[PDB]
Amino acid sequence: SSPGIWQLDCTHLEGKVILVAVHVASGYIEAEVIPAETGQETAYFLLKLAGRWPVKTVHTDNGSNFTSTTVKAACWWAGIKQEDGIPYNPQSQGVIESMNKELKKIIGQVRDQAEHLKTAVQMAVFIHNHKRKGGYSAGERIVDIIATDIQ
Amino acid sequence: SSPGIWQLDCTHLEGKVILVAVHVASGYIEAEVIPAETGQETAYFLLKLAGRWPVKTVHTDNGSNFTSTTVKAACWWAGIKQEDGIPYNPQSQGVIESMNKELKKIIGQVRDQAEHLKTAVQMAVFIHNHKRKGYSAGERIVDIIATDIQ
Ligand SMILES: O=C(O)c1cccc2c1OCO2
Ligand SMILES: O=C(O)c1cccc2c1OCO2
Description:
2 copies of one chain form a homodimer. By secondary structure, the first copy, chain A, is an alpha/beta fold. Chain A has a single domain (about 1-150), classed as 2-Layer Sandwich (Nucleotidyltransferase, domain 5). In chain A, about 50% of the residues lie in helices and about 20% in strands. A 5-stranded mixed β-sheet of chain A has the order 3-2-1-4-5, sandwiched between helices. In chain A, a hairpin with a 2-residue loop joins β1 and β2. In chain A, α4 (about 90-110) crosses α5. The interface of A and B includes residues 123, 147 and 151 of A. Chain B: This is Integrase. Chain B: It comes from Human immunodeficiency virus type 1 group M subtype B (isolate NY5) (HIV-1). Chain B: It is found in: Virion; Host nucleus; Host cytoplasm. It is classed as transferase. Keywords: transferase, fragment screening.
């Protein structure tokens, strides 16, 4: 449960890009729809995440965001250690692929309800983070993990 | 002051609107820049907030968002009790006014650094939530909700 570590994950749907940050120890996520994954979009997403949770380390999702000066500048600004996201544990690739599939399935389940993709993605964030698996939810786990770490 | 209670607050800068949700018991915030405060923007912001923290009650920032069918639909969807934001306790007006001024002060302190207002507002959320007063608001909200879960 290393309380400060997050992983970036970028997935595609409807010609659009969904950027996800996963808190690795809990499975809790935040996500956004963007028109394309650029360093600027990723840097802004990181700044938002790190203002909201104590982001110590981020495993970036690809080499272009690992390289990006703009991403490195947001990581410097927000006190984040930027790392690569090489699956030294190969069970990592499989966990992220399954989350993406789960997220896309929830997006499909909420399509009668959202006119824009960005709404369906935030409904999927909500359902993902509140899902009991404990059975604790990922929202409960990340709070428990970080609070234990503060104490 | 319950773990689940938040207050909406809408403030203006640079002819743009900044929408803030404050977790009342900790002072922790999330905020966004929007072109205008409409029911649709407010409903979307609430959906985002409630997928991220366990939002039980929202004190809406004005009667238009309290009334808005779109705001009520997002609160229904996310399981949030929508309430008014009448300051039955008058030290509320002043606590919110003071946060707006501190937020605008930080936005000013980061303007050499951000080309867009939205970046400066998220730098201000970051500095607000990490500021030690000695725990930070980010620490207090985590402690409050974890104590509640346990
Ligand atoms: O239910 C929770 O305690 C919770 C805690 C932290 C974050 C969250 C949560 O629900 C979804 O996003
Ligand atoms: O520093 C923290 O524990 C913290 C915890 C939860 C949320 C946050 C935080 O800092 C910024 O936003």
